Amino acid sequence: LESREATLNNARRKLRAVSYALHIPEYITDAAFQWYKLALANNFVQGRRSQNVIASCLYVACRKEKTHHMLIDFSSRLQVSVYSIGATFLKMVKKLHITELPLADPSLFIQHFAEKLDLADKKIKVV
Amino acid sequence: MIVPVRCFSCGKVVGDKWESYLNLLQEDELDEGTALSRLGLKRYCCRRMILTHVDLIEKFLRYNPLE
Amino acid sequence: DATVPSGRPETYIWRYLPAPPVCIRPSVMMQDSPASNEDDLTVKLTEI
Amino acid sequence: TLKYICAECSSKLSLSRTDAVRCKDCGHRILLKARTKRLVQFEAR
Amino acid sequence: DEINTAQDKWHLLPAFLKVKGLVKQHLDSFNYFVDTDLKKIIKANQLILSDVDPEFYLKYVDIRVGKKSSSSTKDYLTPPHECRLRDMTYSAPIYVDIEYTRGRNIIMHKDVEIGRMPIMLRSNKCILYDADESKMAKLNECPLDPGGYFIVNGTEKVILVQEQLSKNRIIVEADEKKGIVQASVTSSTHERKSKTYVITKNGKIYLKHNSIAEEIPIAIVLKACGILSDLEIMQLVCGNDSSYQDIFAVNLEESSKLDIYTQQQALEYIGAKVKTMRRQKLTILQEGIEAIATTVIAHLTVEALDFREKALYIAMMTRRVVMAMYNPKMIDDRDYVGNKRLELAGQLISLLFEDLFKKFNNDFKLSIDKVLKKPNRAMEYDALLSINVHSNNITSGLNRAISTGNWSLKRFKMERAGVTHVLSRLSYISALGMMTRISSQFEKSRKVSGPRALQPSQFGMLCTADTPEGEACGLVKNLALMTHITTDDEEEPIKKLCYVLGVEDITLIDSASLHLNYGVYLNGTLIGSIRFPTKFVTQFRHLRRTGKVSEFISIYSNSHQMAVHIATDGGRICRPLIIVSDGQSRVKDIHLRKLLDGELDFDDFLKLGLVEYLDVNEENDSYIALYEKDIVPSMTHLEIEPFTILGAVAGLIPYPHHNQSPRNTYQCAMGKQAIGAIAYNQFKRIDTLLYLMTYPQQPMVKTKTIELIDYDKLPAGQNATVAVMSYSGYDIEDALVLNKSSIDRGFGRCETRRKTTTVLKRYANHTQDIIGGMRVDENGDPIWQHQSLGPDGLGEVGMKVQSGQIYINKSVPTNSADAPNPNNVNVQTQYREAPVIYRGPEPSHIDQVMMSVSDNDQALIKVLLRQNRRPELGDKFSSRHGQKGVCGIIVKQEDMPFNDQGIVPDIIMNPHGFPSRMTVGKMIELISGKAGVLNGTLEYGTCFGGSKLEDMSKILVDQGFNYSGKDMLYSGITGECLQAYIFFGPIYYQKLKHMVLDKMHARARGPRAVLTRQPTEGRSRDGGLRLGEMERDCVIAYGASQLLLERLMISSDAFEVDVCDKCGLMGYSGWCTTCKSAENIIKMTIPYAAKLLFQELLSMNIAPRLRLEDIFQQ
Ligand SMILES: [Zn+2]
Ligand SMILES: [Zn+2]
Ligand SMILES: [Zn+2]
């Protein structure tokens, strides 16, 4: 519909809003929208906050890539608790039949910590 | 790049005279005109090969990919 | 003049308009995307 | 074999495929393919 | 070495270009933008505010580019040659500092990232600023590179020095059929783009503007400014004892018609017919809307109370109307060089940035109160969390406006395109000669060849011999070798300075006496009405030479009217000249020898008062002497060096003064095409298409210009041994003859490198691309197509490729756009092939292939091919003086002639150019070159000087040859001597581009376009050539009536139409589909482009009924 086109043209500004902020590259925003698109049709966006569902939808796309981004870097911009946005993440994954998923591998997070930590120029031996 | 192994117009070889013509300039400071007459380049078609040879091989080599 | 069917002056203002074939106005694929760069002649015929 | 080398570190990297595109010993992200061993046949004119 | 001031004033021209180079105008503009001209932006867009919750405020205190305030180190930056191999932008981030209202207490937070400014090379913010061939060797960047150009995402671009007419000044105009006009455009820096006109309808002065609904005659708009007594009007405009009272006398009685007579009644007649701008409140007084109508007009001068100084600026604007009606010889042209304002990069990138910066903090404003319209979300709400969503419109705004060179502004609402170009790395000076050029505005006077021509007021301002031809013939021009563009300083203190020197004021002088005296004009505005100007102006320069005022001023003082001028507006041309006091100059060669010692540079020369900058307007009054042997006791401003009227790209011509004048504008257009060397890092870079020569040589007849830009440190082309004569008839129309044995020794073997690239794209459904390769058959891995593809998929560096022969294998998935199914069922074979095939008609080699990643993690592949070739016939050579030539034949060595010693010439050119082309340079370049070989020393051919002739035949007679270089030689076909004498010697022949290996085309029957079903335009689109309308009329003049039908429908556009007979219009395979009987049909054939006319003409309501006869039975 025109109202259904207008509710995703607005919802396209939301995904490009946080991805400009957290340095999410552009091949995840476009990958994130189909997860929003199937959750749009299946009556998941009604009632809940607009800005609370799109970050939970984006974290599905950031988990599948196996990238260094946590979950609390979404919530600290939004100034809510981790457990608020985490609870509506759990009601997304089991409702919408997401079976295969990567694990939160902690070995990913070591390599990304060092660069903004501003340690010594021998940054390989610390890794 | 490096000096051409033969002259363009007549045909004789100039590859063993580029280091010699320089060594006749570092030691025994000497005219550019009287150097390469002693060296053996008589006619005026071989003398342009060493007068005007820009030697870009010493500046290309400092960008070697092997540190 | 008369004596032809379409010789009335009624047929000189638009009441029906024909649509051309798509051979005239072909859907050129620029392949800058998996979307088709549709030419300006159909998108006018749809706003009508 | 004698696989990919680095830009200024100049260290021979044999990276396992679809894993990474950086090099070791240095953080530089430009990997030059090194020359083959196979004979190539030229003329001399 | 007894130095003297007669022939050694040249030695301070290196003292100019050492401290102050050749890319002054680009480097010193952006460096003034970064340092100072950012702080004048945030100080005019500070204090972002909200109306809801009025105790919130965020203010920008200061702004910085580069380093922080915590670490305060230099930086760590992606190097420029590391940045062009990854399609990234070379940029540095903008840092600001802020304080704002968090809540209970305000908080001041530093170093907020809001964007990334691109920075041009060799600026003081990039890492290449003052390096010493060891830091710069680590960064594998060339020492001899000019710098001054962005490397935004790959390609490297350069903002060009635009120019337009002088803003904030008036120009007089004439026309016969239209009357005359008076344009006066004014652009104050805040929203204002306004031009006013002073027009004459049938003998009456008016004043129109594009915010006033009609015109107003000027007797209203001077009583509106206080000048009311109606004798004061004529006393200002006309003067006394003149015919100007008679021409102007019509406009006086229109005060009697409109019956106004007083300054109170004068205003409201304007604003009665003003076009009312929508104020949304409209407090219109009918008393103040006219008092501001004398504020939004002629925005040069603003008023406080008196309206007085604005009045007699309108009176001086309408006096030069009346004088133009008295004789139309007093008019001015808008092509004089004093009426042009050059404007640089950094003072034009600032018009873009403050558009982007105000667009930043009014999207960031409305994102705040969208949260602050909440009851709970007003206490703990912090604003810097949501700053980074808006930061991306600064970076992507700047990088999109540099790549696609069109700048979409809002404040002036103007859409200049073409403002950036990609620089050409064809040759060394092809990329340096672009950095000093001028791109004009084409104000749509396409009929008039006035501005297409060249003005005499251009001697040494900007170059005279470099200008293109063809479509762009006089609107593209180049700076000369000695040139500096001024900068505006301030007009408040110099207005206070001129009162001290003895000028009166505008508010005291009687209007009877302002025409009897002269008048100081400050930026076109009269303020003082000086008397005895020549004591006033000569005391002004003694403040300037000794250094009380800045040096970028002009004291132009004409005498056609009674006015003296000052100009401090900046962005206008100048050059320096040494002051001559009287019949003895201020040369003082004890100062000049102390320059060579190295403590007294060029900058200290103008600090003392030995030299100063003159623009084109200050050359109205001065009387520049050429040489020191020409000093008169009325003679100022000795010319410092006379060959500086030619830039660094026209400068390489040897003996330009002997040569003809159109044979210097033919070489600048081709010196930018001659192949050669590029830089020192040229085997490291990956560019789109880079020509190289194997063995280049520096020229024999040099110039002082080529050693001041270090051209001969990496030259282009090599000097052959020309024996100018006719030979075998293959050299008739300036073609030329070279020998086969010299080409095999390596005379002119070029080399051509060509990038090509791919990108491995990551899709929506999490599918990559793969580089699997070398599918096998029958005990062997390689196919014919994969002999040079390697094990890893990327083609193997070091071995050749032929036609066919995939060299980058690539597979792309088949579910390219389907929705991600969150499972794992059927994904094992989905990759269809899409390889990269080497086309081209010759086998070329693979030089180097690298793989890396771009700014966002999406891999890159950039393989660079390589082939070298030899100059067979068709390959276009030149002469460095402008004599093009197709190589006509390649004969053997033994058929070439030979002198007594055995010297076979390299190249023979015919004698039949020198009478028509009048190139006496090549006849001198050959004498000054041969004598340099025999003496072992290179010789100079400069402009307006150079090595003489009579001292050069003395060397040429000692060694044993002829006194005119014209030796005698035998023949190689017949054996005996030649009955004439042959002019023999070495001439520098640079090789050009435009070779025939990539111009031979051959299309038999190929691709066809879709809407027209004709052959496809473009050699890369597989060709087929256009038999036009100029060539169609040439055929019918022969009377030939069967190949005209064959060349225009058979071999081009044939198509078989079956058309119905009655109600005749075409249908498909066997139908009529409008009389559905399918009975009356005739098979014929017509062009396809008339099948599609008969359906376009049918789609609008026009019916082309066809009526047929049979051919036979007349
Ligand atoms: Zn020789
Ligand atoms: Zn490394
Ligand atoms: Zn019919």
PDB file of N, CA, C and O in Angstrom, chain E residues 1053-1090:
ATOM      1  N   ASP E1053      19.406  -1.180 -42.539  1.00  0.00           N
ATOM      2  CA  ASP E1053      18.162  -1.078 -41.787  1.00  0.00           C
ATOM      3  C   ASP E1053      17.018  -1.851 -42.442  1.00  0.00           C
ATOM      4  O   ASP E1053      15.862  -1.419 -42.377  1.00  0.00           O
ATOM      5  N   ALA E1054      17.305  -2.985 -43.076  1.00  0.00           N
ATOM      6  CA  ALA E1054      16.254  -3.693 -43.795  1.00  0.00           C
ATOM      7  C   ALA E1054      15.288  -4.370 -42.828  1.00  0.00           C
ATOM      8  O   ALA E1054      15.658  -4.782 -41.724  1.00  0.00           O
ATOM      9  N   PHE E1055      14.035  -4.484 -43.264  1.00  0.00           N
ATOM     10  CA  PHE E1055      12.952  -5.030 -42.458  1.00  0.00           C
ATOM     11  C   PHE E1055      11.770  -5.308 -43.375  1.00  0.00           C
ATOM     12  O   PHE E1055      11.493  -4.519 -44.283  1.00  0.00           O
ATOM     13  N   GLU E1056      11.083  -6.423 -43.143  1.00  0.00           N
ATOM     14  CA  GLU E1056      10.065  -6.922 -44.067  1.00  0.00           C
ATOM     15  C   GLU E1056       8.685  -6.688 -43.457  1.00  0.00           C
ATOM     16  O   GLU E1056       8.265  -7.407 -42.545  1.00  0.00           O
ATOM     17  N   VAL E1057       7.983  -5.678 -43.969  1.00  0.00           N
ATOM     18  CA  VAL E1057       6.669  -5.280 -43.474  1.00  0.00           C
ATOM     19  C   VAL E1057       5.609  -5.816 -44.427  1.00  0.00           C
ATOM     20  O   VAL E1057       5.736  -5.677 -45.650  1.00  0.00           O
ATOM     21  N   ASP E1058       4.565  -6.427 -43.872  1.00  0.00           N
ATOM     22  CA  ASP E1058       3.381  -6.817 -44.633  1.00  0.00           C
ATOM     23  C   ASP E1058       2.228  -5.891 -44.261  1.00  0.00           C
ATOM     24  O   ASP E1058       1.756  -5.903 -43.119  1.00  0.00           O
ATOM     25  N   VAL E1059       1.781  -5.090 -45.225  1.00  0.00           N
ATOM     26  CA  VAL E1059       0.813  -4.027 -44.995  1.00  0.00           C
ATOM     27  C   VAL E1059      -0.467  -4.355 -45.754  1.00  0.00           C
ATOM     28  O   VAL E1059      -0.420  -4.887 -46.869  1.00  0.00           O
ATOM     29  N   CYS E1060      -1.609  -4.062 -45.136  1.00  0.00           N
ATOM     30  CA  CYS E1060      -2.889  -4.275 -45.792  1.00  0.00           C
ATOM     31  C   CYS E1060      -3.073  -3.272 -46.929  1.00  0.00           C
ATOM     32  O   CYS E1060      -2.439  -2.214 -46.969  1.00  0.00           O
ATOM     33  N   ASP E1061      -3.957  -3.616 -47.867  1.00  0.00           N
ATOM     34  CA  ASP E1061      -4.127  -2.796 -49.065  1.00  0.00           C
ATOM     35  C   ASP E1061      -5.139  -1.674 -48.844  1.00  0.00           C
ATOM     36  O   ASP E1061      -4.806  -0.493 -48.988  1.00  0.00           O
ATOM     37  N   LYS E1062      -6.373  -2.026 -48.500  1.00  0.00           N
ATOM     38  CA  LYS E1062      -7.402  -1.045 -48.192  1.00  0.00           C
ATOM     39  C   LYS E1062      -7.515  -0.868 -46.684  1.00  0.00           C
ATOM     40  O   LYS E1062      -7.283  -1.805 -45.918  1.00  0.00           O
ATOM     41  N   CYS E1063      -7.865   0.347 -46.270  1.00  0.00           N
ATOM     42  CA  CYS E1063      -7.488   0.892 -44.963  1.00  0.00           C
ATOM     43  C   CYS E1063      -6.042   0.521 -44.633  1.00  0.00           C
ATOM     44  O   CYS E1063      -5.741  -0.159 -43.652  1.00  0.00           O
ATOM     45  N   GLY E1064      -5.136   0.996 -45.485  1.00  0.00           N
ATOM     46  CA  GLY E1064      -3.784   0.478 -45.521  1.00  0.00           C
ATOM     47  C   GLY E1064      -2.910   0.946 -44.377  1.00  0.00           C
ATOM     48  O   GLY E1064      -2.447   2.091 -44.352  1.00  0.00           O
ATOM     49  N   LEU E1065      -2.684   0.050 -43.419  1.00  0.00           N
ATOM     50  CA  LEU E1065      -1.703   0.254 -42.366  1.00  0.00           C
ATOM     51  C   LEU E1065      -1.214  -1.106 -41.889  1.00  0.00           C
ATOM     52  O   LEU E1065      -1.950  -2.097 -41.927  1.00  0.00           O
ATOM     53  N   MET E1066       0.039  -1.138 -41.448  1.00  0.00           N
ATOM     54  CA  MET E1066       0.776  -2.386 -41.307  1.00  0.00           C
ATOM     55  C   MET E1066       0.225  -3.239 -40.169  1.00  0.00           C
ATOM     56  O   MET E1066      -0.321  -2.733 -39.184  1.00  0.00           O
ATOM     57  N   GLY E1067       0.376  -4.557 -40.321  1.00  0.00           N
ATOM     58  CA  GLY E1067       0.042  -5.501 -39.276  1.00  0.00           C
ATOM     59  C   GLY E1067       1.124  -6.553 -39.138  1.00  0.00           C
ATOM     60  O   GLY E1067       2.162  -6.492 -39.800  1.00  0.00           O
ATOM     61  N   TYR E1068       0.864  -7.522 -38.265  1.00  0.00           N
ATOM     62  CA  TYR E1068       1.854  -8.537 -37.938  1.00  0.00           C
ATOM     63  C   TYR E1068       1.692  -9.753 -38.856  1.00  0.00           C
ATOM     64  O   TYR E1068       1.020  -9.681 -39.889  1.00  0.00           O
ATOM     65  N   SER E1069       2.307 -10.876 -38.463  1.00  0.00           N
ATOM     66  CA  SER E1069       2.694 -11.967 -39.361  1.00  0.00           C
ATOM     67  C   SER E1069       1.732 -12.233 -40.516  1.00  0.00           C
ATOM     68  O   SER E1069       2.158 -12.391 -41.665  1.00  0.00           O
ATOM     69  N   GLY E1070       0.433 -12.297 -40.235  1.00  0.00           N
ATOM     70  CA  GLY E1070      -0.528 -12.461 -41.308  1.00  0.00           C
ATOM     71  C   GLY E1070      -1.842 -11.729 -41.146  1.00  0.00           C
ATOM     72  O   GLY E1070      -2.803 -12.018 -41.866  1.00  0.00           O
ATOM     73  N   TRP E1071      -1.917 -10.793 -40.207  1.00  0.00           N
ATOM     74  CA  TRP E1071      -3.172 -10.127 -39.896  1.00  0.00           C
ATOM     75  C   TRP E1071      -3.135  -8.660 -40.304  1.00  0.00           C
ATOM     76  O   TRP E1071      -2.082  -8.085 -40.595  1.00  0.00           O
ATOM     77  N   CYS E1072      -4.325  -8.062 -40.316  1.00  0.00           N
ATOM     78  CA  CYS E1072      -4.512  -6.619 -40.339  1.00  0.00           C
ATOM     79  C   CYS E1072      -4.950  -6.063 -38.992  1.00  0.00           C
ATOM     80  O   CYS E1072      -4.678  -4.897 -38.699  1.00  0.00           O
ATOM     81  N   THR E1073      -5.660  -6.875 -38.200  1.00  0.00           N
ATOM     82  CA  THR E1073      -6.196  -6.571 -36.863  1.00  0.00           C
ATOM     83  C   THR E1073      -6.900  -5.214 -36.770  1.00  0.00           C
ATOM     84  O   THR E1073      -7.029  -4.655 -35.676  1.00  0.00           O
ATOM     85  N   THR E1074      -7.380  -4.665 -37.886  1.00  0.00           N
ATOM     86  CA  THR E1074      -8.398  -3.620 -37.830  1.00  0.00           C
ATOM     87  C   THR E1074      -9.541  -3.821 -38.814  1.00  0.00           C
ATOM     88  O   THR E1074     -10.628  -3.279 -38.578  1.00  0.00           O
ATOM     89  N   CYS E1075      -9.341  -4.570 -39.895  1.00  0.00           N
ATOM     90  CA  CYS E1075     -10.413  -5.214 -40.653  1.00  0.00           C
ATOM     91  C   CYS E1075     -10.106  -6.709 -40.600  1.00  0.00           C
ATOM     92  O   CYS E1075      -9.424  -7.252 -41.472  1.00  0.00           O
ATOM     93  N   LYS E1076     -10.615  -7.378 -39.566  1.00  0.00           N
ATOM     94  CA  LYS E1076     -10.158  -8.724 -39.222  1.00  0.00           C
ATOM     95  C   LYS E1076     -10.687  -9.726 -40.244  1.00  0.00           C
ATOM     96  O   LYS E1076     -11.674 -10.434 -40.027  1.00  0.00           O
ATOM     97  N   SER E1077     -10.005  -9.782 -41.387  1.00  0.00           N
ATOM     98  CA  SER E1077     -10.357 -10.713 -42.451  1.00  0.00           C
ATOM     99  C   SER E1077      -9.105 -11.437 -42.931  1.00  0.00           C
ATOM    100  O   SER E1077      -9.183 -12.562 -43.436  1.00  0.00           O
ATOM    101  N   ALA E1078      -7.949 -10.784 -42.775  1.00  0.00           N
ATOM    102  CA  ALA E1078      -6.643 -11.367 -43.088  1.00  0.00           C
ATOM    103  C   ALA E1078      -6.548 -11.783 -44.554  1.00  0.00           C
ATOM    104  O   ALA E1078      -5.942 -12.802 -44.890  1.00  0.00           O
ATOM    105  N   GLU E1079      -7.153 -10.989 -45.439  1.00  0.00           N
ATOM    106  CA  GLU E1079      -7.243 -11.338 -46.850  1.00  0.00           C
ATOM    107  C   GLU E1079      -6.379 -10.447 -47.734  1.00  0.00           C
ATOM    108  O   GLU E1079      -5.519 -10.946 -48.464  1.00  0.00           O
ATOM    109  N   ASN E1080      -6.585  -9.132 -47.686  1.00  0.00           N
ATOM    110  CA  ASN E1080      -5.844  -8.191 -48.524  1.00  0.00           C
ATOM    111  C   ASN E1080      -4.546  -7.796 -47.829  1.00  0.00           C
ATOM    112  O   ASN E1080      -4.530  -6.904 -46.978  1.00  0.00           O
ATOM    113  N   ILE E1081      -3.452  -8.460 -48.190  1.00  0.00           N
ATOM    114  CA  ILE E1081      -2.141  -8.178 -47.617  1.00  0.00           C
ATOM    115  C   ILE E1081      -1.112  -8.241 -48.738  1.00  0.00           C
ATOM    116  O   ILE E1081      -1.146  -9.150 -49.574  1.00  0.00           O
ATOM    117  N   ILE E1082      -0.195  -7.276 -48.755  1.00  0.00           N
ATOM    118  CA  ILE E1082       0.935  -7.275 -49.676  1.00  0.00           C
ATOM    119  C   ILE E1082       2.218  -7.367 -48.862  1.00  0.00           C
ATOM    120  O   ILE E1082       2.438  -6.563 -47.950  1.00  0.00           O
ATOM    121  N   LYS E1083       3.060  -8.344 -49.192  1.00  0.00           N
ATOM    122  CA  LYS E1083       4.421  -8.378 -48.677  1.00  0.00           C
ATOM    123  C   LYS E1083       5.287  -7.345 -49.386  1.00  0.00           C
ATOM    124  O   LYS E1083       5.366  -7.328 -50.619  1.00  0.00           O
ATOM    125  N   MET E1084       5.938  -6.484 -48.607  1.00  0.00           N
ATOM    126  CA  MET E1084       6.935  -5.554 -49.128  1.00  0.00           C
ATOM    127  C   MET E1084       8.103  -5.522 -48.148  1.00  0.00           C
ATOM    128  O   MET E1084       8.180  -6.330 -47.216  1.00  0.00           O
ATOM    129  N   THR E1085       9.020  -4.580 -48.355  1.00  0.00           N
ATOM    130  CA  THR E1085      10.101  -4.352 -47.405  1.00  0.00           C
ATOM    131  C   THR E1085      10.454  -2.872 -47.375  1.00  0.00           C
ATOM    132  O   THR E1085      10.579  -2.238 -48.426  1.00  0.00           O
ATOM    133  N   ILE E1086      10.583  -2.324 -46.170  1.00  0.00           N
ATOM    134  CA  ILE E1086      10.905  -0.911 -45.981  1.00  0.00           C
ATOM    135  C   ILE E1086      12.010  -0.834 -44.932  1.00  0.00           C
ATOM    136  O   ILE E1086      12.318  -1.851 -44.295  1.00  0.00           O
ATOM    137  N   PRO E1087      12.639   0.323 -44.721  1.00  0.00           N
ATOM    138  CA  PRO E1087      13.541   0.456 -43.572  1.00  0.00           C
ATOM    139  C   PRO E1087      12.801   0.248 -42.259  1.00  0.00           C
ATOM    140  O   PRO E1087      11.610   0.542 -42.136  1.00  0.00           O
ATOM    141  N   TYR E1088      13.529  -0.271 -41.264  1.00  0.00           N
ATOM    142  CA  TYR E1088      12.952  -0.407 -39.930  1.00  0.00           C
ATOM    143  C   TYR E1088      12.643   0.947 -39.310  1.00  0.00           C
ATOM    144  O   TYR E1088      11.666   1.078 -38.564  1.00  0.00           O
ATOM    145  N   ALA E1089      13.458   1.961 -39.601  1.00  0.00           N
ATOM    146  CA  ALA E1089      13.240   3.283 -39.026  1.00  0.00           C
ATOM    147  C   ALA E1089      12.074   4.025 -39.659  1.00  0.00           C
ATOM    148  O   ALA E1089      11.777   5.145 -39.228  1.00  0.00           O
ATOM    149  N   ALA E1090      11.405   3.444 -40.654  1.00  0.00           N
ATOM    150  CA  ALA E1090      10.098   3.928 -41.068  1.00  0.00           C
ATOM    151  C   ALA E1090       8.958   3.037 -40.598  1.00  0.00           C
ATOM    152  O   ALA E1090       7.798   3.454 -40.672  1.00  0.00           O
TER     153      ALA E1090
END
